[PDB]
Curated annotation (Swiss-Prot):
17beta-hydroxy-5alpha-androstan-3-one binds at residues 36, 83, 201. The record marks 51 as: Interaction with coactivator LXXL and FXXFY motifs. Belongs to the nuclear hormone receptor family. NR3 subfamily. Changing residue 51 to A: Loss of transcription activation in the presence of androgen and of interaction with NCOA2. The gene is AR. It comes from Homo sapiens. Steroid hormone receptors are ligand-activated transcription factors that regulate eukaryotic gene expression and affect cellular proliferation and differentiation in target tissues. Transcription factor activity is modulated by bound coactivator and corepressor proteins like ZBTB7A that recruits NCOR1 and NCOR2 to the androgen response elements/ARE on target genes, negatively regulating androgen receptor signaling and androgen-induced cell proliferation. Transcription activation is also down-regulated by NR0B2. Activated, but not phosphorylated, by HIPK3 and ZIPK/DAPK3. Changing residue 105 to C: In AIS; frequent mutation; loss of androgen binding. The modification Phosphotyrosine is found at residue 239. Changing residue 72 to L: Strongly decreased transcription activation in the presence of androgen. Residues 1-242 are annotated as: Interaction with LPXN. Changing residue 231 to F: In AIS; almost complete loss of transcription activation. This is Androgen receptor.
C-alpha cells in the first residue's frame, strides 16, 4: 500500500542458518556455541536491515551504531518468535532451520525459563492474530526502543524517527484501540525477555572458558562493551506502559 510497507517487505532479511552440527548430541557447549554463531550471522543482516530502513540515515552516525548495538537482542528474539510462529505454530523455537529447539534443547541450553518466555511471546503472535504487516512495523519500532538514559548524540532526530514509526504502526492498525494497547503491550513484553538474555549471555561470556562455550568476535565485543551499559542501567528500554 504505502511506500512504508513496500520498503519494510522489500528489506526483510531472508533465511539465516546457524551452522549447527545436528548429528552431535545436545550439550550446553554445542547449543550455546551454535546460538552465539547464529547471533553473529544475524547481526550482519540486522545491520544491513537497520541501515536500509526509512529515515534511518537521519540519525547521527554515532547513534546509528548505538541504536543497533542496544536493540539487537529484542529484534532477534522478536523475529525468532515470529519464525517460531509461522513455521511451527509456536510448538518449538525456530531459531534457524538448522537450530530448532524442542523442550529437550530448551533444558539442555540451561535457558529453559527464558525459552518458555520466548515460546509464550511466539504464541502471542497466534493469540492476537498479528498480521505480517503488524509484525514488520512492530519489529521496525523495536530498533528505536532502547536508549542511553543520557539520550543520544542527536536526541531530536531519534524522537522524530521513533514518532513516525509509532504513527505508521497506528496507520496500519488503521475498540480498534484495544488493538493498539495490546500490540504496545506485546512490544513491552519483549524487553524483560531481552534483559534476561542480556544477563545470561553476559554471565556466559565471562565464564566462557570454564564451560567451553565459544563466542565470535563481534558477539564478544558487543556483549562486553555494550550489553554492560544496559545492565548497569546506563541504557534503558523505552516502554509504552509503566
Ligand atoms: C539472539 C539469539 C540468536 C539469534 C536468534 O534467532 C534469537 C536468539 C535469542 C537467544 C540468544 C541468541 C544469540 C546467542 C545468545 C546471546 C546466547 O549467548 C544467550 C542467549 C542467546
Ligand atoms: N493473548 C493474550 C494476551 C494477554 N494480554 C496481552 C495484553 C494485555 C495483558 C495480557 N493475556 C492473555 N492471557 N492472552 O492469552
Amino acid at each position: 500500500q504505502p511506500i512504508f510497507l513496500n520498503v519494510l517487505e522489500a528489506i526483510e532479511p531472508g533465511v539465516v542458518c546457524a551452522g549447527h552440527d545436528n548429528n552431535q548430541p545436545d550439550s550446553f557447549a554445542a547449543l550455546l556455541s551454535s546460538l552465539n554463531e547464529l547471533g553473529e550471522r544475524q547481526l550482519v543482516h540486522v545491520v544491513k536491515w537497520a541501515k536500509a530502513l526509512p529515515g534511518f540515515r537521519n540519525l547521527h552516525v554515532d547513534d546509528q551504531m548505538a541504536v543497533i548495538q542496544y536493540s539487537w537482542m529484542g529484534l532477534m528474539v522478536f523475529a525468532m518468535g515470529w519464525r517460531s510462529f509461522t513455521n511451527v505454530n509456536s510448538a518449538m523455537l525456530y531459531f534457524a532451520p538448522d537450530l530448532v529447539f524442542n523442550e529437550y534443547r530448551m533444558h539442555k541450553s540451561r535457558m529453559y525459563s527464558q525459552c518458555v518466555r520466548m515460546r509464550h511471546l511466539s504464541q502471542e503472535f497466534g493469540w492476537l492474530q498479528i498480521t505480517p504487516q503488524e509484525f514488520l512495523c512492530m519489529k521496525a519500532l523495536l530498533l528505536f526502543s532502547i536508549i542511553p538514559v543520557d539520550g543520544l548524540k542527536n536526541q531530536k532526530f531519534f524522537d522524530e524517527l521513533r514518532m513516525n514509526y509509532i504513527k505508521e504502526l497506528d496507520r496500519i492498525i488503521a475498540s480498534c484501540s484495544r488493538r493498539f494497547y495490546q500490540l504496545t503491550k506485546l512490544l513491552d513484553s519483549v524487553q524483560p525477555i531481552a534483559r534476561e538474555l542480556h544477563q545470561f549471555t553476559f554471565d556466559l561470556l565471562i565464564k566462557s572458558h570454564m564451560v567451553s562455550v565459544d563466542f565470535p568476535e563481534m558477539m564478544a565485543e558487543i556483549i562486553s562493551v555494550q550489553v554492560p551499559k544496559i545492565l548497569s542501567g546506563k541504557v534503558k528500554p523505552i516502554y509504552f506502559h509503566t
